[PDB]
Amino acid sequence: GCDLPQNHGLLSRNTLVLLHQMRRISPFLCLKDRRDFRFPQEMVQKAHVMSVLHEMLQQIFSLFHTERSSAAWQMTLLDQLHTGLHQQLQHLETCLLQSPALTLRRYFQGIRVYLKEKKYSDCAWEVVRMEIMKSLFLSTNMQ
Template identity: 65%
Template structure:
């Protein structure tokens, strides 16, 4: 018990002080993981998209959530986290296991999980630093509605190969947008670090 108090004190100091601030910087490894995730999604193609043109759907991706230049850091990290969480949930179902090659699906899940772990630590820190709870909640709700629409679409299409292909392409587009948001955050962090 005597060792527990100093350990807890050290953890609190690290999460609140300058050392903890560094943990929220989005390192290059986060960018590499994102590019790897996009590559895996591309490799997961099983059906030619041209065969699935009649299955296309407009899922109404909330582009303003990832393109907004006025996003505070906490809101941007929240958007990234929610997007990764929803993609992870989508590809972590029994139906997705039946649709994709187990090796590629496993690697995709692992990469998404690694990114989520880093962003969770970052989200806790930036949320404590910024007061943007309502903006974060609005962003989260918009993304949840978007992914709910994707799940409904899959269900309506009976999880067909074409439906999964349309969803794979859609997720690649939305994930690519989130990768651009990560780049904006990295540049902002770099600007803050150099000033």
């Protein structure tokens, strides 16, 4: 089996804390730019538990590495977001020894599109970050 470093609960947390600290405007002003993203809550089987997780972070990674993301978030907090997403991914994926991941991804496309629509706006960006944070929390009820 795979045993994460004792300090991985500490890793998944630091992502949430960053996603928090990246907040730019008052989520009030954006209650108009809201949207149900239809997250696949039903998810959250140890092997699955890891796939779904690795499934998600890489996506969170992919979504916040964008040319555009770099233009709506202070760069410092991007780099540490990215550093702690890679380090989580890296030793999770080290366990490559031996609907599902697909619902997760259609889900993430929505977010990719929903933005293109709302035209990479300030509020559009909050909505996402915030949304991501929820989903991550939910995700994070897996230890």
